[PDB]
Design a protein around this ligand. Sequence first.
Ligand SMILES: CC(C)c1cccc(CNC[C@@H](O)[C@@H]2C[C@H](C)CCOCCCCNc3cc(cc(Cl)n3)C(=O)N2)c1
Length: 377
Amino acid sequence: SFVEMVDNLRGKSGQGYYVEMTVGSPPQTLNILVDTGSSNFAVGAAPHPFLHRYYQRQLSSTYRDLRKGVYVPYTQGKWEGELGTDLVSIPHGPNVTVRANIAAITESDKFFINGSNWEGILGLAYAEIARPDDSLEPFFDSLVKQTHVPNLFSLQLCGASVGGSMIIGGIDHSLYTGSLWYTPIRREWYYEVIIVRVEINGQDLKMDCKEYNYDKSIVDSGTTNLRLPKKVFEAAVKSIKAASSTEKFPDGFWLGEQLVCWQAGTTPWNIFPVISLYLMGEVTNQSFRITILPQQYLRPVEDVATSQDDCYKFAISQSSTGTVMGAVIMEGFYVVFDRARKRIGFAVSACHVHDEFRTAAVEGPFVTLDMEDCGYN
Ligand SMILES: CC(C)c1cccc(CNC[C@@H](O)[C@@H]2C[C@H](C)CCOCCCCNc3cc(cc(Cl)n3)C(=O)N2)c1
């Protein structure tokens, strides 16, 4: 019954992927951003200039007030609101209805996006990072507790407006090719993983692998960019600068601010390197790698001039809170969040990015000694 969920995601570039849901009785239809980087289910519940619609608790006969406030500060954006429960369904999802915790957003700051077409957020990570605390059961835990939906979901995020699939409860084999490669979920809070090696155009960055995971590495469909700890970001930009020194770019481009353009169809993809991230595998001393094309980390953006140029932003940026494998990394891969078996799977997506001479790949096995040393403590 998974075919009913294929292509159930839509989005705008840089603005998240959303799935259609209903809350309340009678059902109120809302678009909900799918966010593996957080754990609160929250919806616009009061007028906002960027909300086309919002949750009206007054109109739902199944709404229950929890008489408790809540606020969530993200890296970018925050909101506050009132906790409650209500019945929730996913029209292009499993055929079930769950009573779920819902944060009714009454105020927000740089959270909703002008013309994004989504009105709420589905935090898919674990209770340990839920606000106000881990006693607020996340939506997916409630779904698994109340239905027969198996305890896993998979995300196929497709590139450049954008679409994809969230397979709730399983793996749809028509969405990927090759083998799935699995990395352990290190700890059930974020979807935390361990990066054991980084190569750019086949050359090892040769850093202490702890640097790659300082102070954590997470898989986050709710963050656009690949975000790297300061030391790793600097090594990577230096290497990417050198590989592309044929041309020169404003250094504000390398900070993710200034866009760069080329005459339509003449983007010099060949001068940008591929990035390989090696992940801890399932067996002793075994890892695997995912390879990222420049078409993923050069995110296309609208032309700032009166031309029909191809314009892009550098979609790698610096982090102070660990590595973030964001949507730009996930695009072109089929990513299986196998919560039941505490692992995350990667495979080449059916909607993989296309270079002329190169290909995004998931490859293994590799031998990597001392992988446990790569985790930060
Ligand atoms: C709530 C707790 C657990 C917490 C605190 C800090 C970090 C995390 C890790 N996940 C962050 C993720 O949930 C959070 C969700 C957004 C607010 C969802 C709406 O935006 C989508 C369009 C912008 C995409 N681009 C983007 C997003 C974000 C940071 C950066 Cl630099 N770019 C970011 O902040 N996205 C989690």
